[PDB]
Amino acid sequence: GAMGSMERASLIQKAKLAEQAERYEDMAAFMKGAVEKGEELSCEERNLLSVAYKNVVGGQRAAWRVLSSIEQKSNKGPEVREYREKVETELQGVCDTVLGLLDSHLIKEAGDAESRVFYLKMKGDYYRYLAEVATGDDKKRIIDSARSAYQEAMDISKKEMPPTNPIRLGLALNFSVFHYEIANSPEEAISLAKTTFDEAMADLHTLSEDSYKDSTLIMQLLRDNLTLWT
């Protein structure tokens, strides 16, 4: 696309600059360009991709929730619905773009557990965002697509990664949020967060100080959700 003329390394450099400048739409466009070069992503590059799109979709989701709340209080003319729909369509477009990158061809080339779990977690997350706004014939299929991606990620992570691995912990956190917020399964959410926390706690003794900091940060986020939910 529009980034086809730019060197891969230059796209990555500019993504880092865009992050420092808080230009997340630019960051996402640079990272989309980098993915489309066709090469696998390193760990650092995967994180750049994730940060970029999380910020973009995060802004859209926040706007959608503001507008949806106004719309539900209205229930005036068609403007609130129209503008909510505009934001919704834009959000869906970004999710479809991310899912498209994962399907063409990041997941299929990802053979190491760390990369494959990372991408499948992403796939779950972006289907989850589609689920948040879905109301038509395919809504159950969207929810099931999220579930399936998260479940494959969980199965790989349990076999191949320590219980303290940050990607494994973040996956469990997000899958637990899926259960609570999307699948109407609060008990499953709570069980997953609890078991994840406990298994991580038991493995902290193996870690360096720096790895300990990372794992315990995500453990605290699990605990925070457990507190909110109980």
Binding site: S50, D125, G170, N174, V177, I218, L221, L228
Partner: peptide, 8 residues
């Protein structure tokens, strides 16, 4: 409920 934030 809060999901995973961006890394610190």
């Amino acid at each position: 409920t809060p999901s995973l934030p961006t890394p610190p």
